């Protein structure tokens, strides 16, 4: 319904269609390849570039960042002893390169 209503406008142009190697006539793609090294055409034609729309979406949507908390420790003179027990919720995967 919505998809055929809006999308042929955008693939008339090339912000939602297919790449130029596929919408140009095959003789012109063949010529552009052959002549590339002294008379470029790989500039005169736009390629669409479309982000994935699904299976990467936040969905329910929950925080991008956390900070973990203050309470008490066992004292030491020359060292500072810190503990965390982390927060938990649902269905995310942490990368430990992005902790500091």
């Amino acid at each position: 319904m919505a998809t055929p209503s809006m999308l042929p406008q955008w693939a008339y142009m090339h912000i939602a269609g297919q790449d130029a190697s596929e919408y140009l006539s095959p003789g012109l793609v063949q010529f552009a390849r052959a002549t590339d090294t002294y008379f470029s055409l790989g500039n005169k034609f736009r390629n669409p570039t479309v982000a994935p729309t699904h299976d990467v979406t936040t969905d329910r949507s929950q925080r991008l960042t956390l900070r973990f908390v203050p309470v008490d420790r066992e004292d030491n003179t020359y060292s500072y002893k810190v503990r965390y027990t982390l927060a938990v919720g649902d269905n995310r995967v942490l990368d430990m390169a992005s902790t500091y």
Binding site: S21, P26, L28, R33, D36, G42, N47
Partner: peptide
């Protein structure tokens, strides 16, 4: 970012003993 994206995604074939192929065929 600020958009550019255009034709010729890879090497333009030419049998490198020479620098050509054809205009197509007709």
């Amino acid at each position: 970012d600020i958009n550019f994206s255009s034709l010729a995604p890879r090497h333009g074939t030419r049998p490198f003993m020479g620098t050509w192929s054809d205009i197509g065929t007709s």
